[PDB]
Amino acid sequence: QVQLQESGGGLVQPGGSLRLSCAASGFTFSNYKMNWVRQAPGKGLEWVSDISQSGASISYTGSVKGRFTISRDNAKNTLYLQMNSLKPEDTAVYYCARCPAPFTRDCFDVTSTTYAYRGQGTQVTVS
Amino acid sequence: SIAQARKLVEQLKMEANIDRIKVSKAAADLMAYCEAHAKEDPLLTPVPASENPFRE
Amino acid sequence: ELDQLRQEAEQLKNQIRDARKACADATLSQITNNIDPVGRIQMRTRRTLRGHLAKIYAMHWGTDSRLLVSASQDGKLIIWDSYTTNKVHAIPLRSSWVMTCAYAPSGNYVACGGLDNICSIYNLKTREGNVRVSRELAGHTGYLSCCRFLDDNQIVTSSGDTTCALWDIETGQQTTTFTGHTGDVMSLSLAPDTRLFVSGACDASAKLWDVREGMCRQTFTGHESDINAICFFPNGNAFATGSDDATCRLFDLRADQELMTYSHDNIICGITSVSFSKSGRLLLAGYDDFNCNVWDALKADRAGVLAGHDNRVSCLGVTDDGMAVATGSWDSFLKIWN
Amino acid sequence: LSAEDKAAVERSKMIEKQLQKDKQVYRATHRLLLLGADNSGKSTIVKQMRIYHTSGIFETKFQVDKVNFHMFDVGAQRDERRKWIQCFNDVTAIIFVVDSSDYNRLQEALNDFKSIWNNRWLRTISVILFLNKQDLLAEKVLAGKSKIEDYFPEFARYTTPEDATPEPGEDPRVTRAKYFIRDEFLRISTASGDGRHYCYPHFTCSVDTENARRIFNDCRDIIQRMHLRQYE
Amino acid sequence: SSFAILMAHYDVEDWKLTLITRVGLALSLFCLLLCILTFLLVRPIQGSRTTIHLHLCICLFVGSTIFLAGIENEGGQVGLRCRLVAGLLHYCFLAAFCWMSLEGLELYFLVVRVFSTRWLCLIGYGVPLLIVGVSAAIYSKGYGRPRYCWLDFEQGFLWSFLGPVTFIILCNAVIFVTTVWKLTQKFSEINPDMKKLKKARALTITAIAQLFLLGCTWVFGLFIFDDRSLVLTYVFTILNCLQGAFLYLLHCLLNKKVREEYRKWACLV
């Protein structure tokens, strides 16, 4: 059916650079908008990053405006987040979220409590 | 959590022990019923103008 | 433990996949390749029904192949006759955000349901010119998508909170509750022999349910997005489903896997509703832009195109003897093709 | 005429009479949608606009300048809302309510605006936008306990707009922050507009009394710009 | 038969006058026929406006047909047919100049204050019926022309086909100024990124369209009583008798409602 599997957790002291990856299987990945969301311990669901169909439109979050990179491969079917210098305030678990519909730019409900097309999550603790 | 995982395991266990037939039999039955009532469907073989009640 | 349960689930999924690939010895499109195509089929609107004000959401053919129902988001349920194209009854709904309707199997009641988690049931033979309201079935947490009558005293409902339910009207309490989904459900149809039914929800899932036991008998996968329409093949041993990514598919229960797939290389507009023909040879679908398409259900080709709408198609149904096809769209007009 | 035709003609005539009567009533009343967040303050403006006067959906009515408005608040549903918004593709406007005093959720509210703006079935409806709880933002940036730059970098390189109008006699930094937020929303609003639908930002706090009038004016402009494109 | 006879008073005459008037009037009748046919054919554009177009075209066609029928006369004794065709001409044209007024009021309702066919026809025909039947009691007091078939000038009787002209033209002119003001103001914000020349050109085209529909040329019928300026007679005969052609060019051809619909109807069968 729908398969989203994460990779790249671990524990580190501040000042570290990591590579979060999320592999997808169960659809034609060439034409689906994608996002990265995370949940920190004791917190809710908050949005990290977004990327559109082809790779020409990139967007981020102010809290991570200068540290992270959001990339994708429509041939290895994988969404990537790249980090260089972390903080202790970034301990969380990361999910990659697919968009509901194909061939469209609007994207609903990736941050929802339960979602048919969202992975398991990967652990990242920085301290 | 634990309850959802247990329910999923039970559902998969129950479903994995169900016999199945070859799809050729299903296709044959589909063909048989398609050729079983062809002559009674007007939207394949229409009727004269005095039996189609909208034209009249 | 959780890890052991997850490992068992993965192993059982592997086993089920191997079992389903074991019996995939052929495809429907390969066996019926030499069936003579119906050729070019065209149908001119014989009557054109007008009177509504806004979007049209549901339409059900009566037990007689003569009567009809129409249901709109302006607050109207209209009972039509199609011969003289005359309006027989008007019923003003209480709620307006409403998405389903149906006749009774013996032409005595009707039912409706909307965003409010309520199914309202009216009876037809009444001394007043009104079709009075007699029942309200309640107990969901969400919105209803469809409702059908097994008989005049046992009805079936599906909602958007993962559940389905069987109900007995006179008392007004569920007899059995069907759980096992994950997302919201869209459409169910009743078995021709009136013993089972099937359901599809906004996942990669469609399920075959028994009725009086409550236990769910079959689960099917295949689709990349939500599911929007489903029905019963006449012999009660097949179904076809449509999704919101411009794709239809056809399954047979005992095979427990999808048989054939309806797609085109230039369709990027989704599906809204689907119905079968009375002989098992016309599959009629309503697509996202402004069209209906009539398909030969054994070849994955396009028998014909129905145009004449200025907006999206949302309702489609066939008569009970092969007399017409009714289509309805957001342009506030129903049309009867024959 | 036989009896069957007698009955059919009488029935069709009466029912057509009723439907013709109902056409005017359907067209006379305006319909709006209401979206907001849990802490946003939807109910506050709901009460303020009720002043202007189990279940899966709630209704409110009000009357401004001999024109009636219906608002449709949505509750007792689930958190997947990609299927019950489709039925709102024939309404005049969307009231989007946002809070201006919590920086952890402003990005989420921005994403909500992005999602509603670019929808296929919602590419013809205008958005009236209410920024709320201004006094709390003022107090937060006057105290200086935490900085907006902690969450929004480019505030280090921003000057007040030349057309900014700080009427009530406020500190400059209050005006800086307000216009930063409003520009954050209008950047999305002007990134991909096409003359069909336009935003209409506003400045208000939990003690306002002039919200329905703002809705009135935006709706009037929408209806006017619609007629000048179907006739001429 | 010089078309200025509908406005002139000293009975000017030239061969070019009547030749041009005949050509323009025949073309105008054919254009009105085309308008009525095309408007009755196309369904999905009902409303008040298309109703107005269709019925204005009706009354103008009737008036111009009976005009080409009955005007020219030997100049001898006036037959009863001449008198009756004169009165019928009067009625038909005042029907036209009530329909144009109603169109102007519609535009007002559709621009400034943004927030039934039966009543439209009722007003647009009942008013001219009264205004022309109040003069039915006046017979042979100048009714049918001693050398044509039209109204006379005695006792100031010709203020039934020029007074309403003046009133309607002035009201439509005021509405034109208001519409120009408001739409000018709005087009600064609707398309702020387009050059000034294209803005001026589009505004001028629209101004011309509702110049012809909101009939304003006929104001020359107020400066023709000076019996020297043959050039004013000529500009009248050029701007007016092409009324049908300009109507069909402006509110029938340029509209996008029928542009992508007549081509499809050509492929109906």
- Cα(C72)–Cα(C61) distance, integer angstroms: 16
- Residue among C133, C130, C168 nearest C151 (CA): C168
Residue C269, chain D, CB below 8 Å: the answer is no
- Cα(C124)–Cα(C129) distance, integer angstroms: 10
Cα–Cα distances in Å, from E214 out to D221, E169, E195, E235? 26, 8, 28, 18
Kindly list the residues from chain C whose CB atom is less than 8 angstroms away from the CB atom of residue D23.
53
D:E CB pairs within 8 Å: 20
Kindly list the residues from chain C whose CB atom is less than 8 angstroms away from the CB atom of residue D12.
84, 86-87
Backbone angles phi, psi at C9, to 5 degrees: -60, -45
Kindly list the residues from chain C whose CB atom is less than 8 angstroms away from the CB atom of residue B5.
2, 5-6, 9
Burial of B16 (0-12, 13-18, 19+ CB in 10 A): middle
Q: With CB atoms and an 8 Å threshold, state whether D78 touches C117.
A: no
Beta bridge partners of residue C239, listed in sequence order: C251
Q: Which two tokens stand for residue D74?
A: 């949505």
Number of domains in chain B: 1
The residue of B54, B55, B56 whose CB has the most chain C CBs within 10 angstroms, and thus the best one to mutate to test that interface, is: B54
What is the residue extent of each domain of chain A? 3-100
- Cα(C253)–Cα(C217) distance, integer angstroms: 10
Q: What is the CATH number of the domain that holds B12?
A: 4.10.260.10
Which residue of chain C is at minimal alpha-carbon distance from D19? C51
Given this structure, which CATH class describes domain A3-100? mainly beta
Q: Which two tokens stand for residue B52?
A: 């189609």
Q: What is the domain extent for residue C195?
A: 2-337
Q: What is the domain extent for residue B31?
A: 2-54
Kindly list the residues from chain D whose CB atom is less than 8 angstroms away from the CB atom of residue A106.
114-120
Q: Which two tokens stand for residue E155?
A: 């006792």
Q: Which two tokens stand for residue C22?
A: 């074991």
- Cα(E229)–Cα(C271) distance, integer angstroms: 71
- Cα(E196)–Cα(E212) distance, integer angstroms: 25
Q: With CB atoms and an 8 Å threshold, state whether E115 touches D67.
A: yes
CA A50 to chain centre: 8
Residue D194, chain E, CB below 8 Å: the answer is no
Nearest beta carbon to residue A109 from set D81, D108, D151? D81
Backbone angles phi, psi at C64, to 5 degrees: -65, 145
Q: What is the CATH number of the domain that holds C313?
A: 2.130.10.10
Q: Which chains touch D (3 or more CB pairs under 8 A)?
A: A, C, E
Q: With CB atoms and an 8 Å threshold, state whether B20 touches C259.
A: no
Number of domains in chain C: 1
Experimental technique used to determine this entry: cryo-EM
Residue D67, chain E, CB below 8 Å: the answer is yes
- Cα(A115)–Cα(A108) distance, integer angstroms: 11
The alpha carbon dihedral of D114, D118, D121, D126 has a sign of positive
Query: CA triplet C326, C332, C338: central angle to 5 degrees?
Result: 20
CA A64 to chain centre: 13
- Cα(E131)–Cα(E135) distance, integer angstroms: 7
Which residue of chain C is at minimal alpha-carbon distance from B44? C38
Element (H, E) at E38: helix E15-41
Q: With CB atoms and an 8 Å threshold, state whether C218 touches B54.
A: no
Other beta carbons within 10 angstroms of residue E30's beta carbon come to 14
Q: With CB atoms and an 8 Å threshold, state whether A26 touches C202.
A: no
3-state secondary structure of A29: helix
Q: Which chains touch E (3 or more CB pairs under 8 A)?
A: D
Exposure string over A17-45, b if 16+ CB within 10 A, otherwise e: ebebbbbbeebebeebbbbbbbeeeeeeb
Kindly list the residues from chain C whose CB atom is less than 8 angstroms away from the CB atom of residue A28.
224
Cα–Cα distances in Å, from C284 out to C69, C199, D123? 19, 19, 29
Do β-strands D58-64 and D30-35 pair in parallel, antiparallel, or remain unpaired?
Answer: unpaired
What is the residue extent of each domain of chain D? 26-230
Backbone angles phi, psi at E124, to 5 degrees: -65, -20
Do β-strands A122-126 and A10-12 pair in parallel, antiparallel, or remain unpaired?
Answer: parallel
- Residue among C235, C237, C144 nearest C198 (CA): C237
Q: Which chains touch B (3 or more CB pairs under 8 A)?
A: C
Other beta carbons within 10 angstroms of residue D17's beta carbon come to 10
Q: With CB atoms and an 8 Å threshold, state whether C237 touches B26.
A: yes
Whether the CB-CB separation of C335 and C45 falls below 8 Å is answered with: yes
Q: E–B contact (≥3 CB pairs within 8 Å)?
A: no
- Cα(C74)–Cα(D58) distance, integer angstroms: 17
Residues whose CB is less than 8 angstroms from the CB of residue C4 and which lie 6 or more positions away in sequence, other chains included: none
Structural domains for chain E: 3-267 (1.20.1070.10)
| Full DSSP string of A49-118 | EEE-SSSS-EE--GGGTTTEEEEEETTTTEEEEEESS--GGG-EEEEEEE-SSSS-S----TTSSS-TTB
- Structure's resolution in angstroms: 3.1
The alpha carbon dihedral of A110, A116, A122, A126 has a sign of positive
- Cα(A120)–Cα(A108) distance, integer angstroms: 19
Given this structure, which CATH class describes domain D26-230? alpha beta
Nearest beta carbon to residue A108 from set D81, D108, D152? D81
Cα atoms found within 13 Å of the Cα of residue E200, Cβ hemisphere only: 3
- Cα(C51)–Cα(E102) distance, integer angstroms: 29
Nearest beta carbon to residue D77 from set C88, C142, C202? C142
Cα–Cα distances in Å, from A43 out to A46, A94, C300, D41, D99? 9, 13, 50, 22, 19
Other beta carbons within 10 angstroms of residue C170's beta carbon come to 6
Burial of D1 (0-12, 13-18, 19+ CB in 10 A): exposed
Nearest beta carbon to residue D231 from set E49, E186, E190? E49
- Cα(A52)–Cα(A32) distance, integer angstroms: 8
Tell me the one-letter amino acid at C34: N
Q: With CB atoms and an 8 Å threshold, state whether C225 touches A114.
A: no
Kindly list the residues from chain C whose CB atom is less than 8 angstroms away from the CB atom of residue B56.
none
Q: What is the DSSP letter of C36?
A: P
Burial of D96 (0-12, 13-18, 19+ CB in 10 A): buried
Q: With CB atoms and an 8 Å threshold, state whether A46 touches D151.
A: no
Whether the CB-CB separation of E104 and E214 falls below 8 Å is answered with: yes
